Design an enzyme around this catalytic site. Structure first.
Site, PDB file in Angstrom:
ATOM      1  N   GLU B  79       0.928  -1.103   0.000  1.00  0.00           N
ATOM      2  CA  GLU B  79       0.000   0.000   0.000  1.00  0.00           C
ATOM      3  C   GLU B  79       0.997   1.184   0.000  1.00  0.00           C
ATOM      4  O   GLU B  79       0.671   2.360   0.342  1.00  0.00           O
ATOM      5  CB  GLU B  79      -0.945   0.110   1.207  1.00  0.00           C
ATOM      6  CG  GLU B  79      -0.370  -0.037   2.546  1.00  0.00           C
ATOM      7  CD  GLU B  79      -1.334   0.452   3.628  1.00  0.00           C
ATOM      8  OE1 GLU B  79      -1.831   1.581   3.485  1.00  0.00           O
ATOM      9  OE2 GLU B  79      -1.557  -0.277   4.622  1.00  0.00           O
ATOM     10  N   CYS B 111      -3.066  -3.307   4.534  1.00  0.00           N
ATOM     11  CA  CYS B 111      -2.117  -4.300   5.042  1.00  0.00           C
ATOM     12  C   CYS B 111      -2.554  -5.742   4.807  1.00  0.00           C
ATOM     13  O   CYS B 111      -1.918  -6.671   5.271  1.00  0.00           O
ATOM     14  CB  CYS B 111      -1.858  -4.128   6.545  1.00  0.00           C
ATOM     15  SG  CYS B 111      -2.819  -2.820   7.356  1.00  0.00           S
ATOM     16  N   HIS B 233      -1.881  -9.426  12.697  1.00  0.00           N
ATOM     17  CA  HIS B 233      -1.331  -8.281  11.953  1.00  0.00           C
ATOM     18  C   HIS B 233      -1.556  -7.290  13.173  1.00  0.00           C
ATOM     19  O   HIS B 233      -2.498  -7.411  14.025  1.00  0.00           O
ATOM     20  CB  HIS B 233      -2.277  -7.733  10.903  1.00  0.00           C
ATOM     21  CG  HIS B 233      -2.106  -6.265  10.641  1.00  0.00           C
ATOM     22  ND1 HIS B 233      -1.030  -5.741   9.940  1.00  0.00           N
ATOM     23  CD2 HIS B 233      -2.860  -5.204  11.025  1.00  0.00           C
ATOM     24  CE1 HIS B 233      -1.118  -4.421   9.949  1.00  0.00           C
ATOM     25  NE2 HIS B 233      -2.211  -4.073  10.602  1.00  0.00           N
TER      26      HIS B 233
END
Lengths: 383, 383
Positions: B79, B111, B233
């Site tokens: 990104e 992400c 994450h």
């Protein structure tokens, strides 16, 4: 189990400019666009219409409630993004009312993006036959007023419902893909318009097709005779014709007349639309399905997908029995016929207008899914 | 046929700043970053190092000649792109020397990108078991000097060789994915720094884990006790801990201690690097594999992947017999321990500096694959 395209449809803005009007405005011979580029009408879009606007209208033309519940993956292929982090597929997923437990993302690789999404979608459904995937190609192609590329501009989107036991096109596994780092066309972050090496774009597109076709022929032994029709990604008509010519020179005169006839049938809707980048090849395929009177179930369709920079891939699809009953010709024909013809002056007012995302504002546009407002750089759509 | 990650590795730039230094320069209590955020050292990168630079070093750490010939797909998740059309995967494909006949593209979904690439890669290999796919997450996370997100900054890349009969992690088919259009984080075209709703980003990340976890539990009957370790994450350490906490409240006091202990083992390398966005979760998985002394073959590992705007997905993996012999612990540690500490005055000089891609120039940097020059906006790399 066969897998492939169950439904396909495109969408373009309600506006267009005729090439002869453009030629005259650019003080040239109408013939240069009609007879050199092989373009007749160009798609023009206002600032209130973006890739979500097109991708939403296109998919809205083929989605049923049962599709919204079976689709567990939404993919958007575009090289005309509006966010560098958030995928337009997330907004497409909301606007389309697709069930929540799905994966959504954008794929970026020039005009090759949607092809990537389609093959990955083919794999997904092959592994989970009860699931469906929505793959949509959406782009806006602007080069600049008085630009070399101006006559090749275009805008719109093509949506594909990918499933098992498809009704239109069953995809094979004869894929030959190629990757080559070549700067034929690119757009550095920050650059509204793409950087273009014209001659390099030409040679690379024609050569990529040669290399991919030869490999595919080498791995499958299939030649032009073995194909009922071929669909091509094209930045313009005359290009795919030159790539096609360069490769069919050694075929029989009759075989060449047949392949070119079919190519001409594949570019009917494109001659009235322009470059859809990621959807170009798909618009050609739709054209082949709705305009090619001699195709029939079982016929083999070769597909050459290209992406500047450069990626390219060649694959085949087979006509499914009864495919002719699940097309959208009509809506496609109405869509094209009902567009408003802008004069060059109108066209230029529309092309130059900017959408300042940083400024809070309201926009008015009758088109469904068009941008209604902007607040804190967030776009709202008129659903 | 089991399919999964056969080899993995991460790469980060040679510099970093101590979080205590940052807190003191920002007139904030050291403990707010160390305990509050749960960060110790931040990865900092100069302009001569970009997503290609990291992705190439990372992959170079795990690719053999045999791998270069079997890989027919190269996917980059980011990104932090540098071109709006051409995928960084094309340059990575060239620098890595992978055979020509491969499909290469970039995937964009905050992400969550790399996770998309890994799953689709899994599908590809399941269908073509003799082939391998290279999936690399590469990102540079900057929010701005004196920003709310500053202490959560990071930079780097994680590379994954996806294949059949994998040596480290065999992936299961228990995926629960979710898509929701929420503006917790995004970055409009033209914006070097992301737009961030902090509180919303917070609640959305915690709530996504909950919704996804419950669904997976409802569909598979597996609960925390069933997992030997969880990988998340995380924009920062304390986040995944807060999400982990909100969901394991009703478990046994002993179960909570065990899950937290294993979570603490997953964030060892992350506490010394920061947010790698797409590769965050993968940096946690590498940590688990290299730091978790009690893990063993057959243990189950649940992974929670999140991307802003917002998609999330929870999937599981099993440690393959002998995985301990196919990791890169020394290289990783050497990578972290041998970095140069920048003073805050140095860090600020690095960070603000810009690469004017429009200006042709040269650049000197010792790192292999760093930018060597820019000519007509085209970056050349030092191989």
């Amino acid at each position: 189990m066969t897998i492939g395209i169950d439904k396909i449809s495109f969408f373009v803005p309600p506006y267009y400019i005729d090439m002869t009007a453009l030629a005259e405005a650019r003080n040239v011979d109408p013939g240069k666009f009609h007879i050199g580029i092989g373009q007749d009408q160009m798609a023009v879009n206002p600032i209130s219409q973006d890739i979500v606007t097109f991708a939403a209208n296109a998919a809205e033309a083929i989605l049923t409630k049962e599709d919204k519940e079976a689709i567990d993956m939404v993919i958007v292929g575009t090289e005309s993004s509006i966010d560098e982090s958030k995928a337009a597929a997330v907004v497409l997923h909301r606007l389309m009312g697709i069930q929540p437990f799905a994966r959504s993302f954008e794929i970026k690789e020039a005009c090759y993006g949607a092809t990537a999404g389609l093959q990955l979608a083919k794999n997904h459904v092959a592994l989970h036959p009860d699931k469906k995937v929505l793959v949509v190609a959406a782009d806006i192609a602007k080069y600049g007023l008085n630009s070399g590329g101006e006559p090749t501009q275009g805008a719109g989107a093509v949506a594909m419902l990918v499933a098992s036991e498809p009704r239109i096109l069953a995809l094979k596994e004869d894929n030959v893909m190629l990757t080559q780092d070549i700067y034929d066309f690119w757009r550095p972050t920050g650059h509204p318009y793409p950087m273009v090496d014209g001659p390099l774009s030409n040679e690379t597109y024609i050569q990529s097709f040669a290399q991919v076709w030869d490999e595919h022929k080498k791995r499958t032994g299939l030649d032009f005779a073995d194909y009922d029709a071929l669909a091509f990604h094209i930045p313009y008509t005359k290009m795919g014709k030159k790539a096609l010519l360069a490769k069919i020179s050694d075929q029989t005169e009759a075989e060449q007349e047949r392949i070119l006839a079919r190519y001409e049938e594949s570019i009917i809707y494109s001659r009235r639309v322009g470059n859809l980048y990621t959807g170009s090849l798909y618009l050609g395929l739709i054209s082949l399905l709705e305009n090619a009177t001699t195709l029939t179930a079982g016929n083999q369709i070769g597909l050459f997908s290209y992406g500047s920079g450069a990626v390219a891939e060649f694959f085949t699809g087979e006509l499914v029995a009864g495919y002719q009953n699940h097309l959208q010709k009509e809506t496609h024909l109405a869509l094209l016929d009902n567009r408003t013809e802008l004069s060059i002056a109108e066209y230029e007012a529309m092309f130059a207008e900017t959408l300042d995302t940083d400024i809070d504002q309201t926009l008015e546009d009758e088109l469904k899914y068009s941008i209604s407002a902007i607040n804190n750089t967030v776009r709202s759509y008129r659903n």
